[PDB]
Structures are given as C-alpha cells and as structure tokens.
C-alpha cells in the first residue's frame, strides 16, 4: 500500500 503511494509523489528514483 505504502510503496504504491511512495512511487507516486516524487520520492523514488531509478538507477540503470
């Protein structure tokens, strides 16, 4: 539940 919201509000990055 929290990971979904975490991924929507500009808190999670991506690293190639």
């Amino acid at each position, epitope marked *: 539940k929290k990971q*979904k919201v975490h*991924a929507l*509000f*500009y808190k999670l*990055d*991506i690293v190639p």
Partner: antibody, heavy 116, light 113 residues
Framework: EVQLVQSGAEVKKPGESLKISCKGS????????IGWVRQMPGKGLESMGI????????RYSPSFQGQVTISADKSINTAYLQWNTLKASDTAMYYC?????????WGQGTLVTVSS | DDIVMTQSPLSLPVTLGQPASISCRSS???????????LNWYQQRPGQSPRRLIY???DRDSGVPDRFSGSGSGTDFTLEISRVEAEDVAVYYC????????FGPGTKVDINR
C-alpha cells in the same frame, strides 16, 4: 538501459478497434506508475490516465474516462492503451511515460492516423 | 471546481546568450495535504518526445543543465533559463504534478528579432 519502447505507427480506419503498447526495460516495471499522454497534430499535451502495473490500479483523467482502456501485462513489462471503436478525431501522437518518480523516462511516441 | 492551468506568454522571443522566463498559474493553490507542492515543467523540441526539466516546483531532473531553474509557490510558478542556448528553442509546458495531471497550454519559444 532504462527505456520505454512503444509499438509502431498505426494507419487505421474509423470503426476499428486498436490497442497500442509501451514496453519498459531496465528497471522493475511493476513498481513505477505509467501514464499515457495524447498530442493532437499541432496541439498541446494532454494527460489521459495512469496505471500501477503491479496491481493494475488505474486512474483516468476526467476528460478521458470511458473513452479508452488503460491496462498492463506485467509479465512482459508492457502497458497498453485501447480504443473499442476509433474515430477520425483520435488521430494524434500518443506517448507513454513513467509518472511520479524522481526519474523521468518517455516513450518515442506512437503516431495514430485514423481516416476513411 | 476543476483547476485551470495557464501560462504567459503563449509565445516567448528569446536571444541566445541572454536570460529568459516563462510563467505558469493555477486557479487554486497546488499545495498538497502532505505539505509539498507538486508542479512540473517539461520541454519538447520539434519532432521529439517531451522531457521533464523540473519537478516539485524547483527540483531539477538528472542531466538537465543548471541554467534551468524553477520557482514559485501556491498559484504562481516560473521557469527561468539563465543563458539561452540554441538547443533550448522548444515548447515548454507546466503541469499539475498530481492527478488529474492538468497540463498548461504550452509556451512556444522562438528567436527574437
């Protein structure tokens, strides 16, 4: 390595159904929201809706609710945008993008031309 | 009821080697209940996909040159380019950074004369 690759250009007639795709590679596709954006020839950008591929939680913009279906097959890291019956006014460029992350990645676009 | 996003000007003349500024307004405050303000800027060059420049009013995306900056609060937002370069000629869009992700109309940059 992180990329979104969309399906190719579409030449279709009014009345046909259409489902176009966006494949994301190089990252955990299930964990990041995917959005679709429409750009009519010459006009600005418009948000259509977003999907969380992990569980297919979908949220449409009020302007496109009921006009399209957004879905995803996460086993092949692919999101989709679908029309039951195309109109000539659906002629546009359609983009997919990662939404809501600190990183920004967009597909190359799918050009859809609908004409009889 | 629905938020409306505007930009000024709709066409901006620029000169290479000089600064430039674009404004964005929302009809109501964009401050979220969590205290953040979610307002993004995007650049779209002719024949290319959009790319984000700014999120959360002033955070610059990776790879975006430091000549780009975002500013503002509540309903008033600005994108500034401290020294315009050739590659900066493009259309720029502000966007409400939470659902329903309303885009501004776009500001078209061209060469001043």
């Amino acid at each position: 390595e992180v990329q979104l690759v969309q399906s190719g250009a579409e030449v279709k007639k009014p009345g046909e159904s259409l489902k176009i795709s966006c494949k994301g590679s190089g990252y955990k596709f299930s964990d990041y929201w995917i959005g679709w954006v429409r750009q009519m020839p010459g006009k600005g950008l418009e948000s259509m809706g977003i999907i969380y591929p992990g569980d297919s939680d979908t949220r449409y913009s009020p302007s496109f609710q009921g006009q399209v279906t957004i879905s995803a097959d996460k086993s092949i890291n692919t999101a989709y945008l679908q029309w039951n019956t195309l109109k000539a006014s659906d002629t546009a460029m359609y983009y997919c993008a990662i939404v809501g992350a600190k990183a920004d990645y967009w597909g190359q676009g799918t050009l859809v031309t609908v004409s009889s | 009821d629905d938020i409306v996003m505007t930009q000024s000007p709709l066409s901006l003349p620029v000169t290479l080697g000089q600064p430039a500024s674009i404004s964005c307004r929302s009809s109501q405050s964009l401050v979220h209940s969590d205290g953040n303000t979610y307002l993004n800027w995007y650049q779209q060059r002719p024949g290319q996909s959009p790319r984000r420049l700014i999120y959360k009013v002033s955070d610059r995306d990776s790879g975006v040159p430091d000549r780009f900056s975002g500013s503002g609060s509540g309903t008033d937002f600005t994108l500034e380019i401290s020294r315009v370069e050739a590659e900066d000629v493009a259309v720029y869009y502000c966007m409400q950074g939470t659902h329903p992700f309303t885009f501004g109309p776009g500001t078209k940059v061209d060469i001043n004369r």
